[PDB]
Assembly symmetry: D2
Homo-oligomer: 115 residues x 4
């Protein structure tokens, strides 16, 4: 699995469950084409988005539906969503984990790239 | 000043200076229209982007060009840019500070919203 | 002002007001001695803790009483407090801003260090 | 395993490996008594610190030796260490994960409490 997403909730100190996640790849058209999508699991994780074959070098966007998550909790959030845009590179390590820590008025994101 | 951007560098412990920022507003046809742009100062701040009259309700996107920033320091970073998307002035006018704390493989963004 | 503390609330998108802050300096016997203390203002800032003369080289600890803060908002948080420990003025005097961004189960702290 | 620590490096986008971690429990003496310690693994994780029997309600301090980590990388860091102080509570969920994301002049920490 070369791309995994992990979403955490900083208010409840828990994994962010059932969060919609959409992945896009930039096309020569210069527009974002849908690539993969999922809802996070009970552990806040989303796996099996793509394969090694499919995940070629390019610019990818990971879009996390944070607003719907906070709305579900009855908490008024600042952001429409959290979007992480990055370039996938062959020179780098094989596996990418995109992590997001969510708060109603803030988020943090990090990438953990490993072999 | 209803919209201010502050960018900090978590590697150097400093303001992130001369960072390009672009602000977009969602149009009637759903396209992102250019709204305002600038560079952060020596204090990592960008002020004077808009006015109270111009800054109407809407969905706005603040794009911070972090990749150029890191590249000028010799660092090849993970992210193309940091993007902050939010609905503004939904419940009347407010003043917004969008802050970003940058590292090569990570970034944090928070909003401070105050009532005029 | 060589040492300033800024505290923000990531739930409300606001300054974190009236937060108690205690600053300690490591003594000759390795004990933490009280150095300065105060509460954040309506802007989430605490200034006037020390002077250039008083703020000598040393290891300092900035303790932010986040648990009292959250409890007054009805929230039972994870952390007792946020503690920031650092060596200051090691290479000559500097101005330090210690910033903390608070959530009930998480906190982020960054330093902005500038040369007088 | 009721207490795990996970340490990530925001500069290299990788797990923070071989980082010293010390856990303390507050004593009636009002002083920190050593409880457990370890070095993070190649995945940035430290497990098997304690048992369910041993990990009673109380105030605990997790102290991460961030300065030595950055020194090893030749990067000048701001903090002496990262310390996370919290109260363990029976009413809450059984498992605690203390995570830290490190930068030379900043860190973030979060707790993920689950059953
Ligand atoms: O709205 C604001 O005031 C700007 O936000 N500022 C800061 C900050 C502020 C001053 C000094 C250092 C960081 C900030 C932002 C983000 C984070 Cl994650 C942290 Cl620990 C601090
Ligand atoms: O595990 C991974 O590969 C990615 O995890 N990243 C985590 C994290 C990890 C475990 C538990 C809690 C947070 C994370 C992310 C962002 C932040 Cl700001 C923090 Cl303090 C932790």
């Amino acid at each position: 699995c070369p791309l995994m997403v992990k979403v955490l909730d900083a208010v409840r100190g828990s994994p962010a469950i059932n969060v919609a996640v959409h992945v896009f790849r930039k096309a020569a058209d210069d527009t974002w084409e849908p690539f993969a999508s999922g809802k996070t699991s009970e552990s806040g994780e989303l796996h099996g988005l793509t394969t090694e074959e499919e995940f070629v070098e390019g610019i990818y966007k990971v879009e996390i539906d944070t607003k719907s998550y906070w709305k579900a909790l009855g908490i008024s959030p600042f952001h429409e969503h959290a979007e992480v845009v990055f370039t996938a590179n062959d020179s780098g390590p094989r596996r990418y984990t995109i992590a997001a820590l969510l708060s109603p008025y803030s988020y943090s994101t990090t990438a953990v790239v490993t072999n």
